[PDB]
Design an enzyme around this catalytic site. Structure first.
Site, PDB file in Angstrom:
ATOM      1  N   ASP A 120     -11.299  -0.621   2.078  1.00  0.00           N
ATOM      2  CA  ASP A 120      -9.929  -0.931   1.661  1.00  0.00           C
ATOM      3  C   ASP A 120      -9.163  -1.349   2.877  1.00  0.00           C
ATOM      4  O   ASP A 120      -9.034  -0.567   3.824  1.00  0.00           O
ATOM      5  CB  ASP A 120      -9.186   0.306   1.093  1.00  0.00           C
ATOM      6  N   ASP A 149      -5.800  -1.673   4.135  1.00  0.00           N
ATOM      7  CA  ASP A 149      -4.468  -1.277   3.782  1.00  0.00           C
ATOM      8  C   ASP A 149      -3.458  -1.783   4.780  1.00  0.00           C
ATOM      9  O   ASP A 149      -2.857  -0.997   5.517  1.00  0.00           O
ATOM     10  CB  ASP A 149      -4.391   0.219   3.587  1.00  0.00           C
ATOM     11  N   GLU A 178      -0.058  -2.917   5.529  1.00  0.00           N
ATOM     12  CA  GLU A 178       1.237  -2.716   4.906  1.00  0.00           C
ATOM     13  C   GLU A 178       2.278  -3.217   5.863  1.00  0.00           C
ATOM     14  O   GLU A 178       2.643  -2.476   6.741  1.00  0.00           O
ATOM     15  CB  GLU A 178       1.422  -1.188   4.638  1.00  0.00           C
ATOM     16  N   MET A 182       0.614  -0.376  -4.626  1.00  0.00           N
ATOM     17  CA  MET A 182       1.237   0.816  -4.034  1.00  0.00           C
ATOM     18  C   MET A 182       2.619   0.947  -4.651  1.00  0.00           C
ATOM     19  O   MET A 182       3.662   0.695  -4.033  1.00  0.00           O
ATOM     20  CB  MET A 182       1.285   0.624  -2.541  1.00  0.00           C
ATOM     21  N   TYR A 239       4.889   2.989  -5.436  1.00  0.00           N
ATOM     22  CA  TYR A 239       5.550   4.260  -5.092  1.00  0.00           C
ATOM     23  C   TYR A 239       6.411   3.978  -3.867  1.00  0.00           C
ATOM     24  O   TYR A 239       6.450   2.855  -3.334  1.00  0.00           O
ATOM     25  CB  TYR A 239       4.551   5.382  -4.827  1.00  0.00           C
ATOM     26  N   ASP A 240       7.210   4.968  -3.499  1.00  0.00           N
ATOM     27  CA  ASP A 240       8.219   4.840  -2.420  1.00  0.00           C
ATOM     28  C   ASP A 240       9.242   3.775  -2.731  1.00  0.00           C
ATOM     29  O   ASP A 240       9.793   3.135  -1.788  1.00  0.00           O
ATOM     30  CB  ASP A 240       7.608   4.612  -1.015  1.00  0.00           C
TER      31      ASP A 240
END
Length: 540
Positions: A256, A258, A260, A333, A335-336
């Protein structure tokens, strides 16, 4: 019939933890369970028993994945520590999953870093890079440089035994940045990599295929992706170090990435560039090529990437071109979407559905479905490639007003280890009662359901504590959405912060049936219904 909680606890969740309780009373903590005093609890995960139910496998249903971090195992309180902040850790015990080894279809080891990192963990990345290069001559291995992936915690990843599901004699405290290289392979590892190897074996022994993935980056380790992706020489180092990890640890079948996030909107210290999206396509193309030449198509490795749940961000990642060039899975993602300090208004941090008149959905009134709809409808991504996240933690605010949605941006918001972030095991300990056959608040909190977005939050009126969280109901709702729309799956961010309730709700929403540790059925109730107006509705 209007439901009342039972007097009895049919399925106990909470477990006494002397170290947690002692910490609350410390003079630098003063944590009272109603949130009225110190705002950080430092609760350990040991407060919850493993609540996992066992579900019948079903190849036709979307998958359940979970992240597990390499630092959740620690809690120096177990060694008599706790006078310092850093000595109070989560203490997540992987043995809880060894005892329930079919709980997840995939576990994602997280996170590896990248030589070149300039963020808050740069000193550690440098230490390991230097460590590697110190050891390599004697092992007949070459020097590594910018772009190469590295573990962040050689001891936690390869040397520990406590909380990683291994026998105590497997612990090796000689493993550190300057000595770990010989142990950096599957048959030698202890630590979390050794525990994951063992968990995957235990799962196989009872009939369950547990896929293992490893993640590189995440929020704190993304600063250098933009630079490696721009530099074809560094892309080539990165890709080869990905292949090398799979060779070292063939129990993994997916990587993965990730990052960001491409184009910015991650941590503000990250390198970023308007070429990030196009350079990511080159990185994925090259990776897909290298993996498939090395391992082929039968024993194949998958590629997953992180995708922001904000439309304006995920547009910068050229995700259609990623899929066209070999990407397998998109981990959304979602969330947040709300957090204290930075958000102008309290809101849901991980809601699946948009409220009425949600506006631009850049800074507030975000939703998972807005992102999915853009991915599917505007970028033509098949639903099967997309994995929908659920959060095992809340985002809290103090001074919240449910009418104006204003709050005290700089106030002390409740959390477990950090301001504003009460983690789900801590929420079950202190703010939400799920033990009496009903989901409700406790210690002054009231469980509410916002009927506009159809998402749940806890609120306590005295100080205006607002906690946006995923509940068994909304995780079940996400599971239902994933099964109905034939998403690839749902994933837990992070698995080590659940006690099993949200994994159960996910399984049940996805349509798996029990083969119970806990009856989830009465926990899926909505709370007190309120209509939280969208910012657009408030402003008009």
């Amino acid at each position: 019939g209007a439901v009342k909680p039972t007097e009895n606890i049919p399925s106990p969740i909470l477990v006494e933890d002397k170290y947690t309780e002692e910490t609350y009373s410390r003079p630098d903590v003063n944590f009272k369970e109603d949130g009225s005093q110190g705002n950080l609890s430092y609760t350990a995960t040991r407060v919850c028993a493993p609540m996992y139910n066992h579900y019948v496998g079903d190849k036709t249903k979307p998958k359940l994945s979970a992240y597990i971090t390499d630092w959740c195992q620690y809690d120096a309180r177990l060694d008599g520590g706790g006078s310092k902040e850093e000595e109070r850790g989560r203490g997540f015990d992987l043995a809880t999953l060894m005892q329930n080894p079919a709980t997840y279809d995939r576990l994602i080891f997280s996170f590896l870093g990248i030589c070149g990192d300039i963020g808050n963990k740069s000193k550690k990345v440098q230490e390991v890079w230097d460590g590697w290069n110190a050891q390599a001559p004697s092992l007949g291995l070459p020097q590594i440089g910018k772009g190469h992936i590295v573990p962040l915690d050689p001891y936690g990843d390869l040397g520990t035994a406590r909380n990683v599901g291994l026998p105590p004699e497997s612990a090796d405290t000689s493993i550190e940045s300057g000595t770990f290289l010989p142990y950096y392979q599957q048959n030698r590892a202890a630590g979390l990599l050794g525990g994951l190897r063992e968990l995957q074996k235990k799962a196989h022994a009872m009939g369950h295929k547990l896929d293992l993935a490893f993640s590189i980056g995440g929020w704190s380790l993304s600063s250098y992706f933009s630079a490696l992706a721009e530099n074809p020489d560094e892309r080539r180092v990165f890709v080869a170090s990905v292949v090398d990890f799979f060779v070292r640890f063939p129990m993994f079948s997916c990587v993965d990435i990730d990052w960001e996030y491409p184009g910015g909107g991650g941590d503000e210290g990250n390198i970023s560039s308007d070429k990030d999206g196009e350079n990511y396509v080159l990185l994925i193309k090259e990776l897909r090529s290298a993996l498939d030449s090395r391992f082929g198509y039968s024993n194949r490795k998958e590629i997953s990437i992180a995708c922001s749940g904000v439309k304006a961000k995920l547009k910068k990642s050229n995700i259609d071109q990623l899929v066209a060039n070999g990407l397998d899975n998109i981990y959304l993602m979602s969330y947040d979407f709300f957090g204290t300090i930075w958000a102008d208004y309290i809101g849901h941090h991980t809601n699946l559905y948009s409220p009425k008149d949600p506006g631009e959905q850049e800074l507030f009134d975000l939703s998972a479905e807005a992102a999915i709809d853009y991915l599917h409808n505007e970028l033509g991504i098949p639903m099967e490639k997309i994995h929908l996240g659920y959060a095992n933690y809340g985002r809290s605010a103090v001074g919240g007003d449910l009418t104006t949605r204003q709050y005290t941006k700089n106030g002390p918001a409740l959390g477990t280890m950090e301001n504003g972030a009460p983690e789900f095991f801590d929420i079950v300990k202190n703010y939400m009662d799920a033990e009496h056959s009903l989901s409700m608040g406790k210690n002054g909190f009231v469980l509410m359901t916002d009927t506009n977005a159809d998402a749940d939050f806890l609120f306590s009126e005295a100080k205006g504590h607002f906690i946006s969280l995923d509940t068994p109901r909304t995780v079940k709702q996400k599971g239902e959405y994933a099964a109905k729309n034939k998403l690839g799956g749902v994933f837990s961010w992070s698995g080590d912060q659940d006690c099993g309730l949200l994994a159960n709700a996910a399984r049940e929403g996805l349509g798996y049936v029990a083969d119970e540790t806990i009856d989830m059925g009465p926990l899926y109730n909505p709370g007190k219904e309120i209509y939280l107006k969208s910012i657009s509705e408030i402003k008009s």
